[PDB]
Amino acid sequence: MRVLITGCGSRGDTEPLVALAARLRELGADARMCLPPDYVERCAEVGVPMVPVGRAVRAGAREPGELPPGAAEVVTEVVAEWFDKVPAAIEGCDAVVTTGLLPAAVAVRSMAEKLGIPYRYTVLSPDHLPSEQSQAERDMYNQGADRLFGDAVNSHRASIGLPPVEHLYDYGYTDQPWLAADPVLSPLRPTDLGTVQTGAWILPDERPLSAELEAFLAAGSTPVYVGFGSSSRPATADAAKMAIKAVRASGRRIVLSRGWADLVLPDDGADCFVVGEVNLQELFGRVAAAIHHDSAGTTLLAMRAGIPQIVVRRVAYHADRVAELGVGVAVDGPVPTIDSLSAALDTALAPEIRARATTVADTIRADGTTVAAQLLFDAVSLEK
Amino acid sequence: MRVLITGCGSRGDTEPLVALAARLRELGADARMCLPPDYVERCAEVGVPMVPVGRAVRAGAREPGELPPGAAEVVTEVVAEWFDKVPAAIEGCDAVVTTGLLPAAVAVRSMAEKLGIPYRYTVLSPDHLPSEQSQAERDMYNQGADRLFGDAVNSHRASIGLPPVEHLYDYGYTDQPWLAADPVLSPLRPTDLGTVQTGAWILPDERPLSAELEAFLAAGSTPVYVGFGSSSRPATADAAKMAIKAVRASGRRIVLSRGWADLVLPDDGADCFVVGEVNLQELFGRVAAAIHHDSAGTTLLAMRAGIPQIVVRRVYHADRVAELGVGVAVDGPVPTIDSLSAALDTALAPEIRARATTVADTIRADGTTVAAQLLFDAVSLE
Amino acid sequence: XXNXXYX
Ligand SMILES: Cc1cn([C@H]2C[C@H](O)[C@@H](COP(=O)(O)OP(=O)(O)O)O2)c(=O)[nH]c1=O
Ligand SMILES: *[C@@H]1O[C@H](CO)[C@@H](O)[C@H](O)[C@H]1O[C@H]1C[C@](C)(N)[C@H](O)[C@H](C)O1
């Protein structure tokens, strides 16, 4: 079949869509995408028909003083822009999957309505579930949503046939939005039972490890991974620095992460290997533990890998899920102390913890995109 | 991570460099360029910061009678010029990537040597790697070079505290040059297993075609592209006339690129169209086939565009298209209307149109990313 | 606000 996958937002909530799409294709389904301009390169290196829409998300890829698509001063432009370019793309489609910017979501749901096809909205964590919010909170969302782009929405719905809608938050998120997160790391709460959880949507990584790294890994004792993301935030660098130290203090080698914008590293004892755009799927399965920030993406990769992990919590969700599962330790504060990171590491490197991380991994799913696909297929097969 | 990218050469030796620079800046790294005056507007357009160095490469870009940057005459001025303007650009960089004019490539590698940052030289065709050269002619190159600018080089080398070097050919190209070309089109030969082939460095173009060009494409049948890029030899204008005829003899419309030859349509006929700068990636996605010169860049853009092609011989890519079975080579510089019509007939055959759009997907589009990650790994290790 | 993000 042909499925349209739209979305407007950052790389964190957009990459999943590219993964569902690429998967739907592997299953012989003409899946096309509607994303902000700054994703063409990506859809290129993965091979997914993608038609650009609206301003670019990444400030850089954007004109001099051109506001971002989330800017209040351009909600209306956003509504119109989408309502305009989406019709071409949603041409021969029997299903639509969306995530991100509500305005663009409401816009897309309408083409789905006009065309009478099924529409699915997805969120990446249970926190973002409408059902996990208070009835009042849901009212602020709908009120503010309506008060912000409501008129613009109903004007284009009218300007094309559909009747006026109210409660744009409920309208865009759907009664029961899909949750593309892993059930073990992001389990549903007792209030979200009527929700459908497919599993995390991650793109497979085939890339091999460079010969140098292969050389490093082979050349000695299993190293520890330290990676805190692409944050250039001063604290992030201190945490990284403090982690290198906790790892050395434990007589262990390191595989450290660095961004494209960081300054070159002065020197590295032959026990530290700097790594950039590496395949984390394959690498995590080559290390003893991972010290990293509070991020679902890295946390899951590590959990699938079955390696103990140390998570430095923000200002704390995943950090704590790691301890709840008894698979890692949530050290905390922007910059934890050498003692703090050292006691955590001592726990992480404990055989019993490694065994627990191993047991856990045996319970993690890797078929979210396929489960998603099977749901879409059944959708078309009963609604179209 | 600042990376300095440089070179002196036709548009085909530059566009790929401008792609690596744009990609690096897109990834978060920074880039700076040292290119001949010809590409200032082009760089401004892509948003890559560039320092103009030396004479212009395009003939019609320099004063009349003025020598080009490759002419053995100027060599010492070239060497001198690069050793003079590169420091302002290279200061603060962590690596450098070059291609093009050897005397300029050596000046850069020297200044990189003084700063202690990795250097990499790239070739766009496998048949240019020093490993597809008899280690006989390779000796001629070193000797030739060492004699031409050699002394001038070591002179400036001296002025900044550097020990002299010999074999300027192995220095400029290094013991393991990079091959920024796609595997399916420009495959390495078993005489160079070692070398690194990153896949062509292409810059995803988003520029729209003009309004008139759109009007044309709309008001009629789908055209055949005719253009020879940086080719500026006399034959070029003749070769263009023979191709226009061959396409008209076929009864198809055409889009002609002025190129560095400043070719003009033979008449005010309404079935043709002349363009200057243009998004070839876009245009190539809107023509039936392309008749062009033998060049790494255009052959690949067409090949990834999924169109049949006719390549005009010199007297590598010509044949590559033939073997891959996506087009036809024809002898030149000025081909006969017959061969061209025979080709335009084979090429637009249901057989070729098929293999053409098939070989299009076997084309890697992660070329600049692979080079980028190779530069990251270099900067760390070294 | 009322639109989401994440920028
Ligand atoms: C003429 C022209 C070329 N190009 C670019 C795309 C090609 O990859 C690049 C180099 O072409 P190429 O044929 O490889 O080199 P040369 O013309 O010097 O022999 O030029 C444009 O983007 N627009 C244009 O209008
Ligand atoms: C964003 O809105 C949804 C709407 O339904 C809520 O369910 C979700 O909790 C909310 O996200 C939170 C947490 C987050 C993403 N960290 C941000 O701080 C936003 C503003 O609030």
User: CA-to-CA distance for B317 and B161, rounded, in angstroms?
Assistant: 43
Q: Tokens 């099977």 correspond to what residue?
A: A374
DSSP states along B77-125: HHHHHHHHHHHHHHTT-SEEEEEE-HHHHHHHHHHHHHHT--EEEEESS
Asked if the bond preceding A173 is cis, omega within 30° of 0, the reply is: no
DSSP class per residue in A185-238? TSPPPTT-TT--B----------PPPHHHHHHHHTSS--EEEE--S---HHHHH
Distance B314 CA to ligand 1 centre (A): 18
Largest CA-CA distance found in chain B, in angstroms, rounded? 66
CA of B168 to the centre of ligand 1 (A): 29
3-state secondary structure of B72: coil
Distances (CA, A) of A295 to A45, A229, A231, A316, B81: 24, 9, 12, 10, 50
For A381, the enclosing helix (H) or strand (E) is helix A368-383
Question: Position of tokens 């789905």?
Answer: A112
Which residues is A293 bridged to in the sheet? A312
CATH class of the domain defined by A1-201+365-380? alpha beta
Residue A148 contacts C where some CB pair is shorter than 8 Å: yes
How far is the C-alpha of A339 from the C-alpha of B179, rounded, in Å?
49
Could you confirm whether domain A202-364 is CATH 3.40.50.2000?
yes
Give yes or no for residue A130 CB within 6 A of ligand 2: yes
- Return the structure tokens found at A280: 């984390």
Q: Which residues contact A251 (CB under 8 A, 6 or more apart)?
A: none
CA distance A28 to chain B (A): 16
- Choose which residue among B8, B10, B11 to substitute to test ligand 1 binding: the one with the highest number of ligand atoms within 8 A of its C-beta: B11
Strands B30-35 and B50-52: parallel
> What is chain C's length?
7
Residues in a beta bridge with A275: A257
CATH code for B202-363? 3.40.50.2000
Q: Quote the CA–CA distance of A154 and B99 in Å, as a whole number.
A: 57
Provide the β-strand partners of residue A223: none
Q: What is the rounded distance in angstroms from the CA atom of residue A111 to the CA atom of residue A5? A: 13
Dihedral (Cα; A187, A190, A196, A201), 10-degree rounding: -10
Nearest-angstrom CA–CA distance, B218 and B291: 21
Q: Does A203 touch chain B (CB under 8 A)?
A: no
Cβ contacts (< 8 Å) between A212 and chain B: which residues? 377, 381
How many Å lie between the alpha carbon of C1 and the closest alpha carbon of chain A? 7
Contacts of B206 in chain A (CB under 8 A): 37, 40
Which one of A37, A260, A273 has the shortest CB-CB distance to B28? A260
Ligand closest to the CA atom of residue A314 = 2
- The whole-angstrom separation of Cα A297 and Cα A104 is 25
Helix (H/G/I), strand (E/B), else coil: A258: coil
Whether C7 and A147 lie within 8 Å, measured CB to CB: no
C→A contacts (Cβ < 8 Å), by residue, are 1-7
**Is A264's CB within 8 Å of B379's CB?**
yes
Can you say how many angstroms the Cα of residue B302 is from the centroid of all Cα atoms in its chain?
Answer: 14
Chain C positions touching A101 (Cβ under 8 A) are 3-5
Atom of ligand 2 nearest to the CA of A132: 7
Please state, in angstroms and rounded to a whole number, the distance separating the CA atoms of residues A30 and B318: 35
Taking alpha carbons only, the member of B9, B199, B229 closest to residue B103 is B9
Class of domain B1-201+364-379: alpha beta
Instruction: Tell me the backbone φ, ψ of residue B167, rounded to 5 degrees.
Output: 55, 50
Confirm if B177 and B132 have CB atoms less than 8 A apart: no
Q: Is the dihedral of CA A189, A190, A191, A196 positive or negative?
A: positive
- Distance of residue A103 Cα from the nearest chain C Cα, in angstroms: 6
Which residue, B376, B381, B326, is CA-closest to B353? B326
Of the candidates A12, A102, A147, which has its C-beta nearest C4's C-beta?
A102
What is the pairing mode between strands A95-100 and B224-227? unpaired
> What angle do the packed helices B150-159 and B137-148 form, to 10 degrees?
60
Phi, psi of A120 (to 5 degrees): -125, 130
Fold agreement (B1-201+364-379, B202-363) = yes
Q: HSE on the CB side for B36, CA within 13 Å? A: 26
**Is the separation of the CB atoms in B98 and B6 below 8 Å?**
yes
Name every residue whose Cβ is closer than 8 Å to that of residue A128 and which is 6 or more positions away in sequence: none
DSSP string for residues in B313-355:
----HHHHHHHHTSEEEE--SS--HHHHHHHHHHHTSHHHHHH
Would you say B242 and B337 are in contact if contact means Cβ atoms under 8 Å apart?
yes
Ligand 2 centroid vs A129 CA: distance in angstroms?
A: 9
**Any chain A CB within 8 A of the CB of B116?**
no
- A257 Cα to the center of ligand 2, angstroms: 29
Q: Give chain A's largest Cα–Cα span.
A: 69
- Contact indicator for B98, B109 with CB cutoff of 8 Å: yes
Q: What CA–CA distance (Å, rounded) separates B85 from A44?
A: 37
Distance CA A249, CA A346 (A): 10
Strand-strand pairing, A50-52 and A30-35: parallel
Mode of pairing for the β-strands spanning A178-179 and A224-227: unpaired
Interval between CA B10 and ligand 1 midpoint (Å): 9
Helix, strand, or coil here: A347?
Answer: helix
Resolution to 1 decimal place, in Å = 2.8
Q: Identify the helix (H) or strand (E) that includes residue A126.
A: none
**Helix axes B11-27 and B367-381, enclosed angle (nearest 10):** 70
Q: Which ranges of A312-367 does DSSP label H, i.e. alpha helix? A: 317-324, 338-348, 351-361
Taking an 8 Å cut-off on Cβ atoms, the answer to whether A277 and B28 are in contact is no
Choose which residue among B205, B293, B298 to substitute to test ligand 1 binding: the one with the highest number of ligand atoms within 8 A of its C-beta: B298
Closest ligand 1 atom to residue B228 Cα is 17
Other C-beta atoms lying within 10 Å of the C-beta of residue A131: 16
Would you state the structure tokens that stand for residue B34, as one six-digit string? 């040292």
| Cβ–ligand 1 contact at B295 (below 6 Å) | yes
Alpha carbons B152 and B73: distance in angstroms, whole number: 13
Answer whether A126 contacts ligand 2 (Cβ < 6 A): no
The span from the CA of B242 to the CA of B255, in Å, is 14
d(CA A48, CA A27): 13
Closest to A146 (Cα-Cα) out of A164, A162, A167: A167
Domain ranges for chain A: 1-201+365-380, 202-364
Please check whether residue B377 is in contact with residue A212, taking contact to mean a CB–CB distance below 8 angstroms. Answer: yes
Residue of B377, B368, B376, C4 lying closest to A12 (CA atoms):
C4
Distances (CA, A) of B129 to B137, B200, B275, B323: 12, 15, 34, 21
Cβ of B100 below 6 Å from ligand 1: no
Residue nearest to atom 18 of ligand 1 (CA): B12
Q: What are the contacts of B305-308 at 24+ separation with CB within 8 A? A: B305/B281, B305/B360, B306/B356, B306/B357, B306/B359, B306/B360, B307/B356, B308/B347, B308/B348, B308/B349, B308/B352, B308/B353, B308/B356
Residues of A in contact with C2 (CB under 8 A): 75, 102, 141, 144-145, 147-149
Question: Counting beta carbons within 10 angstroms of the beta carbon of residue B186, is it exposed (0 to 12), middle (13 to 18) or buried (19 or more)?
Answer: buried
Question: Beta strands B224-227 and B289-292: pairing type?
Answer: parallel
Task: Answer yes or no: are the C-beta atoms of B255 and B225 closer than 8 Å.
Answer: yes
> HSE on the CB side for B333, CA within 13 Å?
9
CB environment B208-224: b (16+ within 10 A), e (fewer): ebeeebeebbeeeeebb
Whose CA is closest to A308, among A360, A244, A242, A247? A360
Distance A127 CA to ligand 2 centre (A): 7
Does the CA dihedral B71-B75-B79-B80 come out positive or negative?
Answer: negative
| Helical ranges in chain B per DSSP H | 11-27, 40-46, 75-90, 102-115, 137-148, 150-159, 168-173, 211-218, 234-249, 280-283, 296-303, 317-324, 337-347, 350-359, 367-381
Give the containing element (helix H, strand E) for A60. none
Q: Confirm or reject: Cβ of A62 under 6 Å from ligand 2.
A: no
The answer to whether chain B touches chain A by having 3 or more C-beta pairs less than 8 angstroms apart is yes
Rounded (10°) angle between helices A135-158 and A75-89: 60
